[PDB]
């Protein structure tokens, strides 16, 4: 049931990222409205700029968390699907790889690594040959709905908000500022 | 049908390498016979040493040629077996690997390479799990005999005889010496 946990964790990350995005958008629009209002509220403008930047940092963090959760759920789905496929086709698969897979138990570390590398890149070449002809690849029937709901790739609105990286000092400063802002807004 | 050409090239390499080995052994035992005797055949001993050196070089070259041919025939057999198994179960493997394999045709170079790497090392992890659970696998049914006469690995003699390497200058000098020796023996 770990796949369901990954799925709904990704859904929660999507929800949190969207909530952060609309909060930032509302703060941006009210900041522009107040700036265009010819108001003598310099302190108000400064603290709204601070809120804007805190919201941007929170949006970046949420987008990164959602992207990593998407990667994790895709990876676990791949693990399970390939695991059952290989569990069912393993006799033929290892028969096709007998010349460099037998004796794996007693082979040395360097020999084992060389053999698995040769098997791995030969299988890579086979995958490339199969993909060359240009057919259509479909989701597994058991796990089609979850992958369709999650999507093949994360939304482009999640990668453009994570293209810039924050230094650890910036990260901790923004964490303190966000905590202070949350405490102030809670009152 | 190149597998048969690889296999009888392997057999011819047996012929050549065994001929080099037993000719070198005969020359070595004859040299030791003449050295043990009281005969003052210093020129004979010198030319015998030259012959022994060029025969060791020829044995090394033959062992290297065997290693190359054996690796080539194993690679061809692996490619053919992967082609057959992949044409058999590509739909299932694509259903397993769909989360990052569909759309590969229109993806950019870097994305294509990253997806290939992720699929490839996921398959490597699956193969490691199969090896870990400890089930033994025999050779391919279709091509069992061709790859069981040649053996799982090249002979230990072909390995330790080819362990030492020669710089290209040594290779060309030894080629010239071998040509001169062949010309002298022919007449």
Residue numbers in the entry:
A (entry chain e), B (entry chain f): 4 to 190
Task: Provide excerpts from the study.
The ρ hexamer adopts an NTPase-inactive, washer-like, open-ring conformation until NTPs (preferentially ATP) are engaged and RNA is bound at the SBS, leading to ring closure and RNA entrapment inside the ring. Our cryogenic electron microscopy structures of ρ-Psu complexes show that Psu dimers clamp two inactive, open ρ rings and promote their expansion to higher-oligomeric states. ATPase, nucleotide binding and nucleic acid binding studies revealed that Psu hinders ρ ring closure and traps nucleotides in their binding pockets on ρ.
A ρ variant harboring a P167L substitution has been observed to bind Psu more tightly than wt ρ38,43. Consistently, we observed a more pronounced shift in the SEC elution volume for ρP167L-Psu mixtures, even in the absence of nucleotides, as compared to wt ρ. We, therefore, also determined cryoEM structures of ρP167L-ATPγS-Psu complexes. The results showed that ρP167L associates with Psu in a similar manner as wt ρ, with a preference for the complex II constellation. In complex II, two hexameric ρ rings are bridged by five Psu dimers that connect ρ(A) subunit 6 with ρ(B) subunit 2, ρ(A) subunit 5 with ρ(B) subunit 3, etc. ATP or ATPγS are bound similarly between all neighboring ρ CTDs in the ρ-ATP/ATPγS-Psu or ρP167L-ATPγS-Psu assemblies. The ρP167L-Psu complex exhibited a ~seven-fold higher mant-ATPγS affinity compared to ρP167L alone (Kd = 2.1 µM). The mant-ATPγS association and dissociation rates of the complex were more than five-fold and ~40-fold lower, respectively, compared to ρP167L alone.
